[PDB]
């Protein structure tokens, strides 16, 4: 058994389905609160009514004192003889130390961290795990709030990514019968402000495996040897755990064309990119890990990151068409109080170039302009002012109709 | 007069004291042990004193270690880098808000 | 409000346990702990 599911999800309960000032929600959150208070009371009584204790077996303190109080951590490198291994400290100073008993001489292996004494400097224990606080921090444990209900309609893309990352888990009977390996790599590309990170959030919200999230220009350190090692440890911790998934965002900071030039720092960038490229698909194995990689311009990527076998599915997010604008407007104004006058038809049809974030900004600007004159309900002229007065930076082309 | 001289004598007594190291916590442990990372180099397992509870201790914090025997001394302000001086303007002898005009 | 506050409280009241030192069963320790392990710190030297 590996570290197992190691699931990452708070996700207490979302049922606020009334979504208004109804009694059902009040009674439901009452049930939630009283269960939480009940569990708290149980743990208080669990910790308060413990009467049994000796817990030293008249020798545990003996072992504790035999080993030094401020034990230090070192790196074993060889074991020439029984009871006379050879270790080293941080500064690279080796020492022909001894090995004492009360240390299971089974799990020690060259390259493993061990616990050492001060005054005599012998081996007295083995440190079980060593993960720096740059990889454990990357992990997520509280799921973000959104879900598929909020997406404005992307049926093709949603179905695609679901066949990629979700379906092989819940119902893995078909793929064996057909004899196929499910795809492992996905690219999300397109113009800015369209929804590339929404699918990341929505997938992370509802899943069962570990989720790891990394942003692009963070795999970089200045000591010439930390980048690739950090990448290696990242994939190691992902694979020792559950069927996790990794989300690398804003890649183009890492991978770009691998050309030859002068400066040494850029050589370091290329070295790190190339190490990741090996890690993803190199020699023997890969493991049960999926990778999602998101960017807003794709042509400037190294041809060795995009070839199939490493990234199997590519998904383009295009600008919304007139069918989708109505859905977006219906979602972002659902919890808004609103007047009988307005019709979203004019706003959606008058313009032909805008995206999801733009619609959200139009909604909030119009609502605020309605507030400006001491009202709550929103009218049509407010939406008109919101659309036209701001939310539009411009561009020019094809002058004066050369074509007719 | 007696109080004043007593105070001064006590201060001089206190200044005759040894320093202490500062260390970053990477994680706690069980039965009153912490894993720390002293600044020059080192990865130690240290013990806490009697006036600090472990539940106060969380990863990535600053603790003070007694230099004599490596014990938890106390918990102190969390980390920042040197460049904070230019940030966070501290006094604003600046212009008013009504001298804009137009 | 108080939901999230009590969440914070209940998660703090939980920490971890280790049992990761590699100590062997006591039978393996034998009485060697006193006999030779105690008689092993002082006789030898580091020998860099």
């Amino acid at each position: 058994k590996k570290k197992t599911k190691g699931p990452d999800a708070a996700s207490k309960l979302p049922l606020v389905t009334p979504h208004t000032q109804c009694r059902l929600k009040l009674l439901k959150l009452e049930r939630i609160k009283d269960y939480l208070l009940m569990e708290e009371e149980f743990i208080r009584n669990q910790e308060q009514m413990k009467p049994l204790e000796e817990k030293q077996e008249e020798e545990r303190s003996k072992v504790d004192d035999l080993r030094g109080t401020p034990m230090s951590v070192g790196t074993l490198e060889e074991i020439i003889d029984d009871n006379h291994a050879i270790v080293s400290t941080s500064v690279g100073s080796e020492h022909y130390v001894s090995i004492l008993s009360f240390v299971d001489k089974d799990l020690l292996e060259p390259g493993c961290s061990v616990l050492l004494n001060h005054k005599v400097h012998a081996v007295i224990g083995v440190l079980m795990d060593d993960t720096d606080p740059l990889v454990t921090v990357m992990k997520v444990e509280k799921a973000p709030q959104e879900t598929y209900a909020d997406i404005g309609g992307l049926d093709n893309q949603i179905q695609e990514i679901k066949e990629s990352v979700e379906l092989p888990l819940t119902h893995p009977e078909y793929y064996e019968e057909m004899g196929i390996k499910p795809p492992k790599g996905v690219i999300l590309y397109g113009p800015p402000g369209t929804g590339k990170t929404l699918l990341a959030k929505a997938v992370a919200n509802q899943t069962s495996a570990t989720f790891l999230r990394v942003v692009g220009s963070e795999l970089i350190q200045k000591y010439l040897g930390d980048g690739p090692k950090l990448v290696r440890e990242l994939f190691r911790v992902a694979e020792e755990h559950a069927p996790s998934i990794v989300f690398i965002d804003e890649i183009d900071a890492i991978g770009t064309k691998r050309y030859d030039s002068n400066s040494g720092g850029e050589r370091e960038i290329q070295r790190t990119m190339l190490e990741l490229l090996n890690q993803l698909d190199g020699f023997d194995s890969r493991g049960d890990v999926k990778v999602i990689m998101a960017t807003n311009r794709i042509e400037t990527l190294d041809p060795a990151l995009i070839r199939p076998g490493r990234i199997d599915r590519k998904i383009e997010f295009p600008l919304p068409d007139e069918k989708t604008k109505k859905r977006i407007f219906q979602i972002h104004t659902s919890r808004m109080t609103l007047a009988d006058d307005v019709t979203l038809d004019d706003l959606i049809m008058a313009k032909d170039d805008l995206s999801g974030a733009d619609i959200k900004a139009i909604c909030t600007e119009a609502g605020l302009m309605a507030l400006r004159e001491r009202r709550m309900k929103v009218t049509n002229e407010d939406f008109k002012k919101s659309k036209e007065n701001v939310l539009y930076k411009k561009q020019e082309g094809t002058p004066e109709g050369l074509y007719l | 007069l007696n109080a004043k001289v007593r105070l001064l004598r006590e201060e001089l007594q206190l200044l005759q004291e040894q320093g202490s190291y500062v260390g970053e916590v990477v994680r706690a442990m069980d039965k009153k042990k912490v894993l720390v990372k002293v600044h020059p180099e080192g990865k130690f397992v240290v013990d806490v004193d009697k006036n600090i509870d472990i539940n106060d201790v969380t990863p990535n914090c600053r603790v003070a270690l007694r230099n004599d025997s490596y014990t938890l001394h106390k918990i102190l302000p969390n980390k920042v880098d040197p460049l904070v001086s230019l940030m966070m303007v501290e006094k604003v002898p600046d212009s008013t808000y009504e001298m804009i005009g137009g | 409000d108080d939901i999230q506050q009590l969440l914070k409280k209940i998660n703090e009241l939980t920490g971890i346990k280790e049992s990761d030192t590699g100590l062997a069963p006591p039978a393996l320790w034998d009485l060697a702990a006193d006999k030779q392990t105690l008689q092993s710190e002082q006789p030898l030297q580091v020998a860099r």
Binding site: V91, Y223, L224, N262, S263, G265, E266, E268 | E41 | -
Partner: peptide
């Protein structure tokens, strides 16, 4: 080809110091 380039850095190894031995041999 003008230069606006940058570079990484290797560490400073010299950090060790001697300490008084405290062996107890009769």
């Amino acid at each position: 080809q003008p230069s606006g380039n940058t570079s990484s850095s290797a560490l400073m190894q010299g950090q060790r110091a001697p300490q008084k031995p405290s062996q107890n041999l009769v």
